[PDB]
Design an enzyme around this catalytic site. Sequence first.
Site, PDB file in Angstrom:
ATOM      1  N   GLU A  35      36.809  75.703  77.840  1.00  0.00           N
ATOM      2  CA  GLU A  35      37.950  76.199  77.089  1.00  0.00           C
ATOM      3  C   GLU A  35      37.680  77.507  76.352  1.00  0.00           C
ATOM      4  O   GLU A  35      38.459  78.446  76.450  1.00  0.00           O
ATOM      5  CB  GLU A  35      38.463  75.162  76.082  1.00  0.00           C
ATOM      6  CG  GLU A  35      39.179  73.975  76.677  1.00  0.00           C
ATOM      7  CD  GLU A  35      40.444  74.326  77.481  1.00  0.00           C
ATOM      8  OE1 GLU A  35      40.953  75.473  77.415  1.00  0.00           O
ATOM      9  OE2 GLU A  35      40.936  73.423  78.196  1.00  0.00           O
ATOM     10  N   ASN A  46      49.887  82.821  75.773  1.00  0.00           N
ATOM     11  CA  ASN A  46      50.549  82.426  77.016  1.00  0.00           C
ATOM     12  C   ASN A  46      51.907  83.113  76.985  1.00  0.00           C
ATOM     13  O   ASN A  46      52.873  82.601  76.415  1.00  0.00           O
ATOM     14  CB  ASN A  46      50.699  80.903  77.069  1.00  0.00           C
ATOM     15  CG  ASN A  46      49.384  80.176  76.777  1.00  0.00           C
ATOM     16  OD1 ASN A  46      48.456  80.223  77.581  1.00  0.00           O
ATOM     17  ND2 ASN A  46      49.291  79.516  75.620  1.00  0.00           N
ATOM     18  N   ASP A  49      55.361  81.333  78.052  1.00  0.00           N
ATOM     19  CA  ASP A  49      56.122  80.402  77.232  1.00  0.00           C
ATOM     20  C   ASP A  49      56.047  80.703  75.740  1.00  0.00           C
ATOM     21  O   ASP A  49      56.511  79.911  74.928  1.00  0.00           O
ATOM     22  CB  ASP A  49      55.715  78.949  77.521  1.00  0.00           C
ATOM     23  CG  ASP A  49      54.329  78.601  76.997  1.00  0.00           C
ATOM     24  OD1 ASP A  49      53.585  79.490  76.539  1.00  0.00           O
ATOM     25  OD2 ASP A  49      53.980  77.413  77.055  1.00  0.00           O
ATOM     26  N   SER A  51      53.466  80.679  73.609  1.00  0.00           N
ATOM     27  CA  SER A  51      52.614  79.814  72.797  1.00  0.00           C
ATOM     28  C   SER A  51      51.200  80.406  72.822  1.00  0.00           C
ATOM     29  O   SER A  51      50.907  81.260  73.653  1.00  0.00           O
ATOM     30  CB  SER A  51      52.606  78.389  73.358  1.00  0.00           C
ATOM     31  OG  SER A  51      51.916  78.309  74.596  1.00  0.00           O
ATOM     32  N   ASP A  53      46.862  79.402  72.424  1.00  0.00           N
ATOM     33  CA  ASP A  53      45.822  78.373  72.369  1.00  0.00           C
ATOM     34  C   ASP A  53      44.820  78.838  71.312  1.00  0.00           C
ATOM     35  O   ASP A  53      44.430  80.007  71.297  1.00  0.00           O
ATOM     36  CB  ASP A  53      45.141  78.228  73.727  1.00  0.00           C
ATOM     37  CG  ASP A  53      46.105  77.820  74.822  1.00  0.00           C
ATOM     38  OD1 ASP A  53      46.927  76.916  74.591  1.00  0.00           O
ATOM     39  OD2 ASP A  53      46.046  78.406  75.917  1.00  0.00           O
ATOM     40  N   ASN A  60      47.069  73.931  71.932  1.00  0.00           N
ATOM     41  CA  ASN A  60      48.315  74.692  71.989  1.00  0.00           C
ATOM     42  C   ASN A  60      49.232  74.601  70.769  1.00  0.00           C
ATOM     43  O   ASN A  60      49.517  73.502  70.258  1.00  0.00           O
ATOM     44  CB  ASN A  60      49.081  74.319  73.276  1.00  0.00           C
ATOM     45  CG  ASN A  60      50.183  75.310  73.619  1.00  0.00           C
ATOM     46  OD1 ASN A  60      51.326  75.139  73.205  1.00  0.00           O
ATOM     47  ND2 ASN A  60      49.846  76.340  74.390  1.00  0.00           N
TER      48      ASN A  60
END
Length: 130
Positions: A35, A46, A49, A51, A53, A60
């Site tokens: 990750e 991202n 959309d 959002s 991380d 998220n």
Amino acid sequence: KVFERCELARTLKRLGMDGYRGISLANWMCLAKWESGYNTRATNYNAGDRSTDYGIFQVNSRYWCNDGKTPGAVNACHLSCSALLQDNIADAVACAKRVVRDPQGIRAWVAWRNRCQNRDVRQYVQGCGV
Ligand code: NA
């Protein structure tokens, strides 16, 4: 902070991650590795959309933490996403524990399915004294 492999393994163990909800320590190590590469300040936007991380486990903002700019988002961990960017991973771990309390479990992170599931993950904790 960018953790060294064994340093992180021992930290996660004392924070009670070994076997949390049936998830072995080596699985948590494999997840953090893929990750963020053990980097606590890792962030990934991202654009598709809107959002982001956050942190070592890349949780998220649409579901886990609040950053204010994500549309139709909830804050299941009841944390500001800023809390997941600290050098101290206490909050990131507490939030990762909340994530796996959902039915999907560790499967919630697609990266885990891709690089950890059904593989020999022993290598992530070998020699760490945990
Ligand atoms: Na949120």
